[model samples]
Target: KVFGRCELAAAMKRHGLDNYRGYSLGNWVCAAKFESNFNTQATNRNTDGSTDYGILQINSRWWCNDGRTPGSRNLCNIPCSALLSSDITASVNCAKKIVSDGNGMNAWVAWRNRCKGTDVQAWIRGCRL
Candidate 1:
């Protein structure tokens, strides 16, 4: 599922992304923009032979066990494929664990480059959220 910006915002809010780890809804919404453009099925292979899965691009080397990642930690104890589902519950839960582990929003390079240090009010204007 490829989400509209506002639609993603509403969904993420429902999943408790708002103000999570001190990062607001706009921060997550903005990260999704650069990470996978809100596409649930998006995947990117890392140079290290690992891959990023889902909209938030959770890494295969750390967050999940793809089984093919060779020494992956699987800290989330879930298959990386779980993150690709359109439902997004697994994605949201894993992302929260990523933040709770002290990785912060900077876990996503997209957020650091585009969403960080910006209020991002413009990203949420149309949603009225």
Candidate 2:
């Protein structure tokens, strides 16, 4: 089970989301649900032996690859199984950065955009925000 709407709303505000405006909080949550059934313990292997973990499915190897050496950016610093230990705002911000950087909802949206009748993965390649 995921956080209730009110709980999510509160967390969003704490994460500076401002009543969750313009941030597609539902979509993010839903995408996580669809991608991994909201299991914070989820993980996937990469070609380089990296592992994508948690509700965000961030790569643990990528996260450590940078954190271990400093000035690096890996989304899996907290480890996939430990995502449940992370604060909600942190997750929101991280996912938002991914979506924003990837442009137009990117993976999160592409994964769940089906519920909205939007094109499938159309924005995945074109999202350049």
lDDT top scorer:
1
Model 1, 1-112: lDDT tens per residue?
9999999999999999999888888888999888999999999998999999998999999999888999779989899999999998999999999988866987889888
Clashing pairs in 1: none
Candidate 2, residues 61-129, lDDT tens digits: the string is: 444342333354565344344454445544555665565554545554326554344432332233322
lDDT of 2 at 56: 61
User: Per-residue lDDT for 90 in model 1?
Assistant: 95
RMSD of 2: 8.2
Assess the local accuracy of residue 20 in candidate 1 as a C-alpha lDDT between 0 and 100.
Answer: 87
Clashing pairs in 2: 63-74
**TM-scores for every predicted model:** 0.95, 0.54
RMSD of each: 1.0, 8.2
Instruction: Give the distance in Å from residue 128's predicted Cα in candidate 2 to where it truly belongs.
Output: 34
